[PDB]
Structure 1
Amino acid sequence: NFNIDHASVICRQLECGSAVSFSGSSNFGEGSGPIWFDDLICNGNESALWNCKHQGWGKHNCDHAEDAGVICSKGADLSLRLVDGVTECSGRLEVRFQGEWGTICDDGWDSYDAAVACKQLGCPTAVTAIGRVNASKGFGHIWLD
């Protein structure tokens, strides 16, 4: 009974940012060690899961021997780059997520988003425009939209 809200509470407790992904079932090993907190209902904003409301401490009968896990924003090796442009400040944006490079959807892309990207890459921010210049469409996944 793991959920995306639970990871957000865990990430915020550890000051690790936002939960970009969570790992379910026996992802990081067969169910082992003392099991303490399962089947608690959180609202997605509380600082810590124990401080978050629950049906009661120890009120859980878990089975199947699964160990939870979570990958947060600082845990993720999130990186940005520009590919297939005239210069190093032009081209198609690519973001590395889960260890694989992927592109970004064109939906909602405007000058404010391009302003953040140019500054983040270290490129000059005097004039920032959207559009991938002469670059071609990528073949990898599309992580962001």
Structure 2
Amino acid sequence: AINATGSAHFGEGTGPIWLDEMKCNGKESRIWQCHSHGWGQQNCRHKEDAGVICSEFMSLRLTSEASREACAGRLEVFYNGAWGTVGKSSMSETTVGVVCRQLGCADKGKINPASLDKAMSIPMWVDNVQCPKGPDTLWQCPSSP
């Protein structure tokens, strides 16, 4: 885990609250093995709903000087709570196709050289990405670790 959010950060659920006041050592694999007050032993409301942000959760966005997210600029990946760029080398046309379709900009795109300046420096995350034909998102495209 990276974050452990609360107060319905991701939204308010509708089903009956099952567990409450959870303390856990972290060794057991299943959530049910942690100490709990019982089943239905809740005194909260739907405004209080737990949420997490795990390490493997990732997102993609094209940063630009004009706006934080846009349809042009430099694409960035977000791994284990940290941001970073993507290696340019070995980037096929279909690779840019998945990036643009995932962000909802256009069916196809093209690679252009860097702009006049960079807003900030971030450590490069991944390189040598080769998207096949058929995947809709970049997370299903094999690449280097």
TM-score, length-scaled by structure 1 = 0.38
TM-score by length of 2: 0.38
Considering Cα pairs closer than 8 Å and 6+ residues apart, tell me whether 1 or 2 has the greater RCO.
1
Decide which structure has greater strand share: 1
